[model samples]
Target chain A: GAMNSSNYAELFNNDIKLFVDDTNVYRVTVHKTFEGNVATKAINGCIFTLNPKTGHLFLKIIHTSVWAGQKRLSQLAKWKTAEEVSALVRSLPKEEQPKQIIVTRKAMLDPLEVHMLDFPNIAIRPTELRLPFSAAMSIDKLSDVVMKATEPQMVLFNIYDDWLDRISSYTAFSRLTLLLRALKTNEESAKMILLSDPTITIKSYHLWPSFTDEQWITIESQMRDLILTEYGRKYNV
Target chain B: MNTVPFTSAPIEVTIGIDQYSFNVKENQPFHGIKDIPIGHVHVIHFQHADNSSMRYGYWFDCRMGNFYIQYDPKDGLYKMMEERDGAKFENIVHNFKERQMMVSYPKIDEDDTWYNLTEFVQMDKIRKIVRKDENQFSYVDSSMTTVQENELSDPAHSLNYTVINFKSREAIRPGHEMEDFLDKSYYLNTVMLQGIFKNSSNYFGELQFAFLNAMFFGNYGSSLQWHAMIELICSSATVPKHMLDKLDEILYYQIKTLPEQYSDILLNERVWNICLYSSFQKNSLHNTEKIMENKYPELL
Candidate 1:
């Protein structure tokens, strides 16, 4: 179940902090206000991790935007019946219209599928999300996750150093974000994380947990379905 | 080589441009007047994007406010049709109700006649008179003033006034001002006082700094060397307080603002040192025409 409260204490009883080197630079504490879009979008707030021992510098990430949720409803203006929208979209270019129909259909069905599983569901809140695949891949690749877990001060510096370099030397601001995809996790946990089924009922709050081996396979399979159905397959399964 | 004694009282020659103001000093690099020589004209060659070369002679009044003549690439004709037909001059002026200026050039077929451009010259001469009077200097309501004055200076010289416009040779650089100067490059050098090491940890920071440092300081040794040399020479006791102040002002602005504002740093010590080392380097030169002008008098 997603923690409805935005408060750090509500999210986790233990304090979180991040660090880059031996120095304990920043301290991580969440804001009390619920910024909304918790299940469908990543939370926007600074992740600061300070050393409990010596209050020196470590890591600080100003997480501008994060996104999660049932994929079916994310892009459309509002949820609508697939048949109603598909007929509307089909009037456009033949190439792009079908892709929109499929994606829209997935978005429309996502909430219902999650509700049927009896998973913790929070209402969708509209907010700008930065879950760009590029930024998420870099953040997920860092070997030192504990530093991020604690919310280090230097996380901004690391992000500025790696991912945002392409746009300009300055931070990308709200330009980048993460997308959480859900897949069947009952099977091998590692492979399931990678599947991309919009019907999968994984809660957005615990998206990081799905990055394991079995979950990844599931996500990959879902992506395979999307590609085969819409984009025509290039890679051998 | 007309020598006007250095005037002690600074006379302000207003060419009516805000930035082009001149104070007379002896042996100035530019003669304080245009001296490109009359009838000694050269065509400026322009290359189009299609890789075709086109040439345009310096003519007066090709476009509104364009006193210095440019060939119209699109028309392919030497003179505008109205001027060629000898149409009523006043009617041509009235044709473009908004146009306040005009140009004169030889008709494409009429090469023997000097295309005298008498009316064009007369209008420019009137503009010059307005320039000589300080009251009209600020009141001229025309954009062609700068171009007109530039062309007029060389032909009519006795220097009622002279305006010096100091601009970088690269101000007209192809991609100049395309983007904010600071956004393009990076400074990699370490500032001893600031305790900031830009290159130690970040790759993007390092790349940007490398590009900028190369532009200004990296071409030679480093920017620090130029800074030390400027401080030693430009601030000497013999130099006029105003002159020294100007040099210091220029250098200080370059150092402080280059990194933060333009994202660049000074690499060319030659611009500063050439003026400073003129005295030392004089003997090595083959020609010593008016050596004292180049030499800064040593401070007592």
Candidate 2:
């Protein structure tokens, strides 16, 4: 019941120090944290107690980044019932070729380079719906529930670079924090003016409107129209 | 942009059918006397969820300490609503009356509106001035009723949890008393790095170095950069010494109570260069990182 990978996986236990988990074979056991009805929710992902195999389960969270075929993993695997996670122990064993995969949230945060080695559990080659898949696949089929419901889509709009860029830059990943700084009008007021009118745009930061000379507008309208479009929604303005 | 000293008369608070009031004691709302714009948060119960997860925030008018919240029924978007909608305003203000969790800066892993707060409760904004009636009344209040009466800066009285989480662009960011700035790693990384490598002379960059150095390594030895940084900072702004000292003490509290992440080696090394390069501006400071390369080459 163990999977092996030469790839490195970083787990945080407070100080966020690096440990070598990928240099050898390792087994993962998960405890269910959510309820059975949770399977029908539109969850992007979930968090669960993760360890090399056991011991410290207090704050250890393993967040996953998944894909359901062509669609952005609209739901999490935790939503699925116990029998399903076992049947799909890897998703339908006798299915046609499926091209789907599951990778750690940390893996996806790293440089956007998707590698097959990073995936230790690739059950099939292609497909969207999971059998009996209501909300997501569960990990607590046999133990104490440890999974957390999540909506990772919220990161796309994050102004702070920590989430989207953590995988790309290693500079401050080991430690992320700071205190306070004075607000500058050019940035703060500019943000406020734009937030007052979000429908203007949210696609690109450079495209945000700037305060006008005399006629109107204090901000450049930071909307990149980058918000909510690809997902089939547009700003009414 | 109308600027004014934050003076208030007295405003009454309305809680679900009940009421309370706060009279102004120290006319100033925060460390600064001038009323400054700020962002605030008040959580509410969403009937749709356990899942129509949308949290809302407000901007303080600063002076009168009132806010705006709007809702366009046609579209389920959040915006400012008018005063006539007083019932909803009351609900929003005294919203999350129960449990809350602090958004730790360094510990935050997931993307969140962490700016959504923790500051502004200060050295002197209370002592006695809000409910002064029958039985329950004590410190920061009076058996004799107010330290005074009329409009107060503290919103919602005892109704709910409201935090003056963030300041406006124009407002000065004050650290806790006896502290220094400790928020945002961007400056610790990019700004300080460029200022040093390029041997910058820009006023803003120099003042920034001062705050950075003052925050991390501190004036432990009154190093050339530490003292010089103070001079540079004082010269750049109109209220440099006044604002700097207060802001300085304010942030020291954060580092004092919080962890070492705010003051460790790698993080402050970025500022140490500013100190080293700062000396270079005055001449003869090991024009080469190569010589020291013998001592700590791992920096490469």
Candidate 3:
């Protein structure tokens, strides 16, 4: 008797017309389950609705294999480094130009470092100035250094900005500040200092380069000190 | 017969029911009563069997043991009730002959058959059942039956229920194993909080810290005081200040909540205070320790 009562209730609850449409959609019609006696006992499906009139056979993307693959692509698209941006920019032959020089007066030097350096001399400031250099220098030639230096710096800055944008949008200003600090102090500086070191020189001056251990140490130490001090002043001021 | 004035002092009545016994008093309505203090209602329930002899089976809360009274039920009633172990119900029938309560199940005759106190109570009180199909559906009590002892087998069955057991007295005692269990539970809960914080990339970590602080110190005025301190620190953008304020709230909360659960060296107020002070004395050292051993090594 208990079994019949329980099974009758279950059957009464299940007396609904159900159909499958397309791949993800399902349609159902209740023939007897919606009866007043059994209506209250109906089990809710994945998408439950209190009002049957408003309920529809809805097709939804649930746990699709495509999403798993999509996640990998999305992550790759979201992460792009400054070096990648610079490389991309260099690949465009139309935008490529010979390196140029930039001249500035000693009086116009950073007020903090105005006393130490020579004025109106030719100096080659690399595009990746944010990166570390052997010593501080400037673009002495007014040729195409804008295309060489500023363009690359702008590209890298853009990449950094983009990287940070995806991370916080605009909400995490503090974290963004830390990111910027890391870029300038660590990544950018390391990149530029390596770039500035000439692996191969023309050696056309007929003067043999000196490489005594003591002399090499003296030059290296002095250059390192100069680079670090100037860069620190530039950042602080 | 000699009678003591109820106004002179509180007289405790021992009532017996089934295997366990409890004590009650003249002023109190029930022999045994456990309270959770939700609003005002006590939500009291008890268990007893109703054949010629009593059989005790049903228990209100799961974590409870047997109890006996020193006196017989006809002489007086014993009652037992507690909140921690659910509403454990017990009553003792004081017997002057044995100088202890005669404990038996509370039962009643129904349909020419006897039923325990729980079934009897349910029969008279239970009316319409909501969600009868669901196990979670609860039975509602409606009627109150105060019957004569002649109506049943025991005369003292009418006596008030008595409270006999409590949260392990060993836990409350200064030195016990229960105190150690409580200490470990507290530490584990703390580590869980740290793990949640470490993995959170959004504001969830900070939110978890604030919510936990509220749960810990909100009972007393400590939470509000700590909140004020934290808000001030956050306003000044002092990261260390915020950290200290949150940590202090957790420590204070753990101390206040686990008074009944732990009485070991770790729960000692003096030791706790010393550790809290040291947390402030050397931030670097504390951070180092946390980095090595804490749940959130990445955060440190």
Interface Cα RMSD per model, in Å?
27.9, 19.7, 34.4
RMSD from true fold, candidate 2: 31.8
For residues A1-237, what per-residue lDDT tens digits would candidate 3 score against the true structure? Answer: 112223322211322211111111111233445445431211111111010111121111122222233333222211111112223323536333112121121211122011112211322221211221101112111112222331122211111122232333222222222332333344444334323545522233211122334543443454455556657877884
DockQ of the two-chain complex in candidate 3: 0.01
User: Which portions of model 1 show Cα errors greater than 4 Å?
Assistant: A1-60, A63-219, A226-237, B1-53, B59-300
Task: List the lowest-lDDT window of 10 residues for candidate 2 chain B.
Answer: B12-21
Indicate the docking level reached by candidate 1: incorrect
Tell me, per candidate, how large a share of the native contacts it keeps.
0.00, 0.00, 0.00
Show model 2 residue runs off by greater than 4 Å: A1-237, B1-57, B61-82, B85-244, B253-300
* Docking model 3 quality class: incorrect
Candidate 3 lDDT tens digits, B89-171: 22121222133222223333442111111221221111111112222212111121112212323322221111111122321
Q: How much is the lDDT of residue B227 in candidate 2?
A: 38
Q: After superposition, how far is residue A91 of candidate 3 from its true place, in Å?
A: 36
B196-231, model 1: which lDDT tens digit per residue? 322222222222222222222222222333333333
How far is B92's C-alpha from truth in model 2 (Å)? Answer: 8.6
Prediction 2 TM-score vs. true: 0.17
lDDT of each: 0.26, 0.25, 0.25
The superposed Cα distance between candidate 2 and the true structure at residue A124, in angstroms, equals 58
